[PDB]
Nucleic acid binder design. Sequence first.
RNA 1: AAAACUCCAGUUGACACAAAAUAGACUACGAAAGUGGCUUUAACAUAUCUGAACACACAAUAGCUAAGACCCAAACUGGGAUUAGAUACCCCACUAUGCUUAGCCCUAAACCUCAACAGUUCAACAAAACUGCUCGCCAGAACACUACGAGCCACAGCUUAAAACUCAAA
Lengths: 107, 95, 45, 116, 85, 136, 97, 122, 23
Amino acid sequence: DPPPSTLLKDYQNVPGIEKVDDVVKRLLSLEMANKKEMLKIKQEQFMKKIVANPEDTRSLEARIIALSVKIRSYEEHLEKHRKDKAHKRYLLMSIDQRKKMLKNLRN
Amino acid sequence: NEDLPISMENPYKEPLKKCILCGKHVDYKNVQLLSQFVSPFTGCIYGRHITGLCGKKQKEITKAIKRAQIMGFMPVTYKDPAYLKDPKVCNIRYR
Amino acid sequence: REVLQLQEEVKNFITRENLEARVEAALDSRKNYNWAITREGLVVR
Amino acid sequence: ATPSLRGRLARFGNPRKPVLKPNKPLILANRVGERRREKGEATCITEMSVMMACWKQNEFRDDACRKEIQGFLDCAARAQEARKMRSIQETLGESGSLLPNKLNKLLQRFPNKPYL
Amino acid sequence: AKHLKFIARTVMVQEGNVESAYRTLNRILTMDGLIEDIKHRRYYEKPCRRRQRESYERCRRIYNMEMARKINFLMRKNRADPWQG
Amino acid sequence: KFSIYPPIPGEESSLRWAGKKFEEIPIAHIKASHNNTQIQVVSASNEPLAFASCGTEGFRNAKKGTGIAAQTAGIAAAARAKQKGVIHIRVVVKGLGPGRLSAMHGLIMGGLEVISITDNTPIPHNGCRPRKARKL
Amino acid sequence: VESFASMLRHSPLTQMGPAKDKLVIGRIFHIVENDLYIDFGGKFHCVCRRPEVDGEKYQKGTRVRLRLLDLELTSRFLGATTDTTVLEANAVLLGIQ
Amino acid sequence: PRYELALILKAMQRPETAATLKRTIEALMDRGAIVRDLENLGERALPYRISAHSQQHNRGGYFLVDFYAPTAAVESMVEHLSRDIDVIRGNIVKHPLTQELKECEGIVPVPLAEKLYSTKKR
Amino acid sequence: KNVLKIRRRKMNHHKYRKLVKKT
RNA sequence: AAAACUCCAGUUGACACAAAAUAGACUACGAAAGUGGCUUUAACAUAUCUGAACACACAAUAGCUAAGACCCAAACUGGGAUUAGAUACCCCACUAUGCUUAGCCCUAAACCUCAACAGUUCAACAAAACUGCUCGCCAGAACACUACGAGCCACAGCUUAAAACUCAAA
Ligand SMILES: [Mg+2]
Ligand SMILES: [Mg+2]
Ligand SMILES: [Mg+2]
Ligand SMILES: [Mg+2]
Ligand SMILES: [Mg+2]
Ligand SMILES: [Mg+2]
Ligand SMILES: [Mg+2]
Ligand SMILES: [Mg+2]
Ligand SMILES: [Mg+2]
Ligand SMILES: [Zn+2]
């Protein structure tokens, strides 16, 4: 649950975020864009908190955290749309795959 | 040995011909263009074999036509009379 | 390099005090998006 | 100009659903369909309309109907002559559209083959 | 209705040539596909037989176009046989 | 050189009829169908000038939907129009029918001058559902 | 001794290139009263119509210059495992010699 | 993201038109939007008549705005301009040029399909 | 192809419907 | 042809919770059922494969429960026709219903009747013949989308599913 005013993923290495205007920082905040920006910021936070080597999406833990954030996205979407059978099926399949890979990771 | 052929591309290849709008951009506001791409009398949209452009651009311009119609920039039944004295791109035979 | 364009375009972005001049300038000005194209693909206005 | 048929039919390698479902197998036949009539001949209707008009005006006065009755007879004769003309025209050969007989002759002089 | 009158589906008479006017009119209407639509919308057309009619018409168009291509391709070959024997 | 397209209220229209502009010319209206066709004449300002039909002419159920009845109705309406002082006319046709093409010839024989022909036939964009198909 | 590869590399056709949009001189070997067949080069002859201008000036051994589309007319249809041929070649003439 | 508002209002005089424009931009700022620029399409006779909230209008002024705003601003502004009477229509859309055009290499020739039917003498 | 068995099942199901309507 | 309406019909002006010409000769999305008017929001699983008829989630139209909606169509019904007879085909009027809500039922020629995965080049008809692995299904016709039993918000049902008698065919 990151704040809304946090700038996008891509605009972090650039050092011009401090020198640039406040309105520019606002429109660069992820709250303006769609929620997939928020989701990638979330998964970056999780990979930085957990994973020893970031920038490695091939890893089982990276796949797992990606599926977890996607699952929470689908949960919110279903709670707004109780009648979305397609997203409900997608959520169920995603949870099943997540448990499969949790099993093999435990192994 | 030297006179023998060799694996090589065909420089006789004619470059892939591009439609009149393959590279250009289309919007829901260029009522001139979007009226060139429709029948004058009935207001029916000319299909691909009448128009002569790629499917992506046909889809773009037809969606833009519907958007302009519902928005108010263009009518549905009668083509705008002011855009009649413009280049005829879409081929026909009735005249 | 991409940041610099919209950084400089902030000056073009209207605000409250710029409103009561930009509105008048725009409604006094006129602009169109219409343009046609011929058989070979040449733009014509 | 012709439309493509890559994945229109129900084929084994065609994953998605089929588009076309022709009853008979689509192969180029070596004979062309033969021409048909258009409709049932009709004519002189306006002539007999003028005739009935003048009739109901003048109470069947033929020496006064002379004009339109002569026009009606002449139009009937013209239509019959035109039928004979178009008949002999179709016999001698349609202009612009070649005859199905010679077309089939050409197709069977050089027909297509679906087999090897 | 609320659209303006006498722009669409119109044809201007010249020299009182009503027959040629109506001929051009029905020609353009058929080329746009309007009389067909009207005569088919007289009665309701179910989706299943609509799809069947549409697929049959597609295949008919394909076959007729290819036949016409071959006819235009082989009209030149129909000439006086040069080598009789 | 001739323009098949009709004029526009916006200038310029270099073609008048009887010293009058295209817009104010009266309108003939035709409603065609399978069994009967109805004809009417109206001024440019909605004022109905003349009206008649095959039924008023005295044709029966089998024969209302024919070309000869349309011709007779056109003759009668043209007679009324010439009596009221109308020469030129703009044609408007609505729907298919046998006497559709015949009504125009009827008007011409009656002695009117059609300058334009308009087909304001109904086309629904899948709006309403018609009746079910007949099994003959 | 010279290899067929060398003779092909130095052949007139390899330097000719695409047959379309190219002039060529040719002569006729058989001629019907209405049309004439030019043997110009390659495999096939090209059949042509006698022009309205200079009608009689067409006899055996006449060197006529003309362009051509392709040296063989073919086309593959929907049920043709092998493309139909014409055994001829399309060509258009605009001069002689 | 970017949002283009196509605005169609009734033909009326410059003072009240500018009043409507400034109050609309004030609504944008209240919702939290940031205006990029204003584009005037101009006054034109509408192609087809429209029945507004209370009247019918044949002529109309077309204006266009491009701005940045969150998602809820879209619906809020839609209901705002729907309650508004001076405006005949207002439609929010996204920017076309934001969709970077896929590089085109021309139209490929479609060879006629084959092997739909087996090799049989029949 | 032939549908004789389909018609057999048809009349079976119809007679069963009638039987259930009666009983 | 009859019957029906004349509070009817034609032009013109205002008006919907109904269904979305042309584009579409396009072959795209979705696991399937399905999806082709416009704008916005959210969103379109798994970077080995298979895999539950011991589960879960869906599942066209039709149908059921309680509110609402009314252009049109229409089972049923009524009337008019035809017929020896017509409980139908033809015509006119109208109803459940088709639509939006919160639920239920869980079936189709649900078929493209061609299983998923990775690949190669002949009984007949059909959409050419095949290889390696995997799950599911089948064993004469009919009795049988049946009886009994067991489960389901379903109670004229749905799913599973036989047996006796008969025949030498199907
Ligand atoms: Mg079949
Ligand atoms: Mg279509
Ligand atoms: Mg229901
Ligand atoms: Mg009801
Ligand atoms: Mg289906
Ligand atoms: Mg099956
Ligand atoms: Mg399986
Ligand atoms: Mg059943
Ligand atoms: Mg049962
Ligand atoms: Zn293109």
